[PDB]
Paper text:
Bacterial [name]+ proteases are composed of a [name]+ partner (e.g., [name]) and an associated peptidase (e.g., [name]). Here, we present the cryo-EM structure of the [name]/[name]/[name] complex from the major pathogen [name].
The [name] double heptamer was resolved at 2.7 Å overall resolution. [name] is in the extended active conformation with the chamber gate, made of the seven β-hairpins, opened and all catalytic residues (S98, H123 and D172) correctly positioned. The pore formed by the β-hairpin collar is ~30 Å in diameter and is much less constrained compared to E. coli [name] crystal structures, being ~15 Å51. Five out of seven [name] β-hairpin NTDs (Pa-Pd, Pf) are fully visible from residues 1 to 28 while the β-hairpin loop T11-R16 is not visible in the [name] subunits Pe and Pg. The [name] hairpins also form stabilizing contacts between each other via T6, R13, G14, E15, R16 and additionally S22, a residue that is not part of the β-hairpin. These lateral [name] β-hairpin contacts involve the loop of the hairpin for protomers Pa-Pf, while they shift toward the base of the β strand for the Pf-Pg-Pa interaction.
Numbering used by the authors:
A (entry chain Pd), I (entry chain Pb), J (entry chain Pa): 4 to 193
B (entry chain Pn): 4 to 8, 16 to 193
C (entry chain Pm): 4 to 8, 15 to 193
D (entry chain Po): 5 to 9, 19 to 192
E (entry chain Pl), G (entry chain Pi): 4 to 8, 17 to 193
F (entry chain Pc): 4 to 192
H (entry chain Ph): 4 to 9, 17 to 193
K (entry chain Pg): 5 to 9, 17 to 193
The structure:
């Protein structure tokens, strides 16, 4: 992980590349979603909301998704904080990554032209007694209905369509995700 | 595994007396063996009673239903005797013996509980697995209610956690008809 | 496995002398090789007596199942099929493959139908080749099952998407069996 | 070794049964089958059970106990090396006056071994079952030995190693075989 | 494996001059098939042998041992495809007597180039590559003789796993007839 | 990794060798391409655009390639930023490594005389239900069409030629990669 | 492994003085083959023995055990390469009786120097190298006797793995003729 | 292992001819089997010779002395024939044969070495284990000295490292009496 | 790896021993050659060429060799830069290390009196369909021809002689490496 | 490994205990010898010659030996260097460690009273074809001849005597090592 | 943990001249100990050094390293047993300056003969045995001189594991007094 040196007209200082990007208000979501990752993202979004409650935040998303509860943590923090978070799919947004994509400010969800979006129903596991498997199934089905309903709200597709389309793994190009409504536009190559 | 001289093993010699031994987990290969023996003993004499000895930790539910269905389909009555342990699929086979002819030895144990399973993968697949194991539990509770005479609600309540019955409690529950007193 | 007699059989060989075939295991090429050898031996013994196939399997290899299917269709004697416990995957296909009017289930056996399972690795064109092969395999299965059951290919296509469990009476209403063996 | 007219099948003709291994459901199934066979052969001649066992499953040992009490022929028990708690339990289960040890045989009595994992309710159910199993074993030992149930409760708390003379004084065996 | 009386099922079928190839072709399998073929030639040199094939193939030199045996012996070896014939299984399917190579209607055939590994010093990788290429040339030349297809067509068509139905295998000339049910 | 201590009008700083090269605007890709490497390389490219939109960036490639999505992340970051990225093959550019080599600016893609370029179709796999295997095959076939189309744009070869030339592991010398159009020029000392 | 009645297939072949060598050569395989050779000499001192070879070879001292047994006994041993004869397998192939070394047309032969290893002290690696070199000398000398090739030529040709067709093995003098199918 | 019916295995039919095949490493289970075969062949006839065909890397020294002491205890002469290799105790059992009746085949090889061992734990235990392996090497060197006619010092020096001997060198050493020339 | 600090002038500069040697334009190549090592060596060469385009680099070689593409990366970098690179074999130069040893500037290849040089043909693996084994063999054979051409130019032996000598492992002393032309002289101690 | 803080008119400065001993020109050869350890030792010897070329270096040996080519990279003690390297055995000098002990300057090789020295022939191995085993055997034997020749010239024992005495593991007390000539004096307890 | 003054706790203890031997004795810790003892000798050649010992012992050559360095440096090294001193830990405990070996009141001291191992040839096992026996004689002799106890008594008592209290270690002479709490 490279270090960047920058002049400040009051001194000179060394940052990690991610910490300099964090000074620009850029958050890197570049790995699977787990507890440690969600804790980091939440702390970064809360620090940045504390520093400046008007300026946008830039969540960069390149992840295979991950834990649904940690994704809901990042979602709820993004909806709680005052400043708008702008989601940019850099190459890959799958599972909760494609949800954290669709979870950004309206008009401010972007993808690079060759980024991949995958939407699919959640994965889980159940073991032991029949009643324990019943409890786990009912919980994962409520989780899927919560995800589908948030997606229907943020995407404008009906819940029946999101149910049908997430049944198997649906791979979207950025143009397909723009026509779906998971993103607002595809970034024109400056 | 000793031999009786013709050169039977001890189980083949007890099969000559129409005795079948269950002494293992119930799986497809054990159920396939027991079903084969039951069809053989039906072909050897369709009248004389079969004697099924159970010391099993339970096992596969579809293999136990295989045995159950074969016991119900053959003409000869199957006397079931519990020797050491009868755990839920063993207890289900114990109940499946002929009425008036289900026995336990005085220190045998019975255990009744709901079926075990699992699921992985998509929410729809976990749904289908849960639905299947719930319908399997309903089918088990229904057959148990018919065999014991206990209500489905009572069996549902009693099977929720592992319920360990003595042979006298298994007679009171109606899982067996008699306790075999030593001669 | 208990012996039964100097004519010392094992229990399955004594059942084979009564023309009983026990399919109580996963279907691999080894069990398919044994089942096909039993079918050919029993055909050689007598071409007009019925065969009784007893099925309790999770299925297995599709090519081993088709080996068994092709053998029971090819040989002259009728094969009665009797589901004893589970008939999943190719086990349900071999259940449905029995002679008409001679496909049975015990009163609470269960039948499960699903699409075939496979995998692929390596280059994109190799994955394409494996996908084309497994889709042709699924089409072959759905076609044969549609002929054995009378159910349309579209319906079997819809119903085999996920694991579809059937009771014996649903399997009869699906036409996978002809009747349920009501106990004496 | 094979004897033409195996060594255990030849000894079974003499109504000799060898329990030279851990008690598990396979061993119990085999011993029960041999006991039912020897009952079907001759309902009145004695059966000799030679015991050299580290014990094993409690329910598999109760299978044997209940079979040797159920059948009509007397089962003599003869301890030649090891009788560990389930093996000493089956030793106690021999016919009265017909329980033997060889002079250097080792008898051990101890309480059941057990595990439970998972919910507090499930650990409670397993603890209750193991404590009721210990009560069943202690009661049956009290009847077979004649020792107080409180004495057996105290003595089985830790692993107790008895000599053959000590097992005779305890009442687990009736004689030590003089050579 | 059931007993017939004290044959096993395969030993009884061996009396009808049936051979079952129901497994991967390895040295032990080739050794057995070759011993069976030689025994059946000794029992009667004028009477057909029936070879039933359900195998994924395997070792090329074991398959060539079987091929050379069925070509050296006097009787006609009928080949019947039962489920799969892949790799040297489809080669041994093609090696049966002309007019006596069969598949059942739902069997399938796969033809492809052989599989190889070479860990090496560069001269040793070269030697292994030259050997595997001569092995492919041998296989393609014999397939061309057995099918009547050109060695260029067989080269082009074995380049990736080519799954053939029994109809496609009859069109290719790998079998002479599809055995309709009796 | 060694350190270099470098002086200015204000300072001593102790740089790692890669941080010193990054100060020059030099990015090293000396690794498999995975999401971590994609994120790092993208962040560096963004910081280099941040400091000066006009000056050329240099990307130095010694990679067996890797993930197609991570490589397309790098590719799209190269195509978004204003500054020209020079791509230099230092020893190996295989898989997405040669794709990222072809991603450099027209006239500013280089290889060293003994470098090698390899082009192939992407590797993947599939498991489970026939419908799942079909969906995976469809996805990786669309990914190969994407790669082939972008390579046709970078190199000027027809899609049918790139389709044939990537069917198996095709190894190019730097002079062959120059004739193929994957690079513009071979670096001479 | 089919039965024939109560023989197995290999024991029924052994009744006809057929020995099958369809595996790697280790001490158990050697001890089996040597016992069969001794029993065949015990039953009839004049009738030929037929040794079918399909082997990757293996242990060198096991191969020399087989070699010295087939050279010690009175009856001539016909060797038939089928499939593959590598390493000590092709050495035993050449050890057949003159005019009685055969291969099948698509069989193939490999000749190469012996493989070994050494560990520990310089003195121990020296001792092991000297022994593997004396073993290679012995193998080359015997091959020169049985093929009539020069020992310098065999030393050169065995340096790397050398795969020979049945015709090339005939020209090399490892076999006397190919058994062409009738 | 192939079968011959007059229903033997090939080794048991060779046992009819008094042929013992030592084709495997010498552990206690092999020594037990060979000593049993020797005692049986002594029972069947005490005057006819026994043939021991040796192809082994050797093994346990106590299993080697088990076989050696059985060969020397039984009355009938044991002809030893090296077929492939005789390393370690295999060369020792090769030398154990009857005088004038130790043979090798022309390309067989003999290896004579010092016995391997090990020690772990306390200095006193390592000392005891070393002293035992030294007395084992002494015993081996003495038996080789008397059976080969070489002196203790020569064998001690020559067995210090792995000494491979050709059959001609083993005849010069006195481990074999003749090389079996082909019939 | 010990730190060294005490210095003339401001004397602030604490180095690890390798950074202190890098101050003297000494590069160490004392490990297996891989892309990580090759990228490090290349970066150090580029840095030293930027700092001074005229002073010799000194490259100390104690490596069993390794990856051939990584070695060619190092080779092409030492050939591209303007400053001469002196190569010193301090203990071993096997395979690709002996190649980089021979790649030093003329008159500037050295070995210590007891260093050993081993030349051999490249090592390879190919798991394959027969066309894939053909492809891998053809590539490893082209790689050997490239290596032999370069060695022949750097060494003055004919490419047929290097073909003959590299077929097995050839272990050279420093005197034999001097006679061969892989090094220019053996460093006499003084 | 603990830190030392030292006080100077220039400031207060941290050292790990080994960097503080390196200030005093003390080199700890405290491990098995591998290429990385040899690299470290060679780099230290070079730095210490750079700072002062006529001031003794002290090499402290507690090593189970190691790689022979790494030990030969150390064997010189970079005998190129002008400074005299003293060698002290602290507890163990196993064959390459005792070789490096004997490499010290004459009159400046020491061993603490209760130190032990071991000499033996080099360990190795060979696998593969007969000619590859031959190549490896010829190499290991020539390496042993080289080690015996160096030990002969540095101890004054005949090559025949070192050949006989290194055949098996030979353990020498400090006094026996002085009689052999691997060291000049046993350190008296001060 | 850190102490801002910015030491870690062990570096601050070393500032006092306190060395902790609280770990397995391996070559790495022996090197650390030696280094530290020579630095403390440089810092002041008269002030005592304190070695605090809580170790199961370890390598005998690493212990003899620490020993011979301790008994060379000018200042008196004080040894304190904190909780355990076993094998070479008890040896380094006894190695402290006379009058200045201490134990805490319920620390334990264990003395036993060294462990070793031998493998391979009889003469290799003889050499490993002879070496471990000379190592034991060396240890016994040093302990005899540092405790005032006969070599026969140490030989007899170190045969098995001997566990000493601080009072028993004081009577043995391995320590000079037990530190009463202040």
């Amino acid at each position: 992980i490279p270090t960047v040196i920058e002049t400040t007209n009051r001194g000179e200082r060394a940052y990690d590349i991610y910490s300099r990007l964090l000074k620009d208000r850029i958050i890197m979501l570049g790995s699977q979603i787990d507890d440690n990752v969600a804790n980091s993202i939440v702390s970064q979004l809360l620090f940045l909301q504390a520093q400046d409650s008007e300026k946008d935040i830039y969540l960069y998303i390149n992840s295979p998704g991950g834990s649904v509860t940690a994704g809901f943590a990042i979602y709820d923090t993004i909806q709680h904080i005052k400043p708008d978070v702008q989601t940019i799919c850099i190459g890959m947004a799958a599972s909760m990554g494609s949800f954290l994509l669709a979870a950004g400010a309206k008009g401010k969800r972007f993808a690079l032209p060759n980024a991949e979006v995958m939407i699919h129903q959640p994965l889980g596991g159940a073991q032991g007694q029949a009643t324990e498997i019943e409890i786990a199934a009912n919980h994962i089905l409520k989780t899927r209905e919560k995800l589908n309903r948030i997606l229907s709200e943020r995407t404008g597709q009906s819940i029946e369509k999101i149910q049908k389309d997430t049944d198997r793994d649906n791979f979207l190009t950025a143009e397909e995700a723009k026509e779906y409504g998971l993103i607002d536009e595809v970034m024109v190559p400056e």
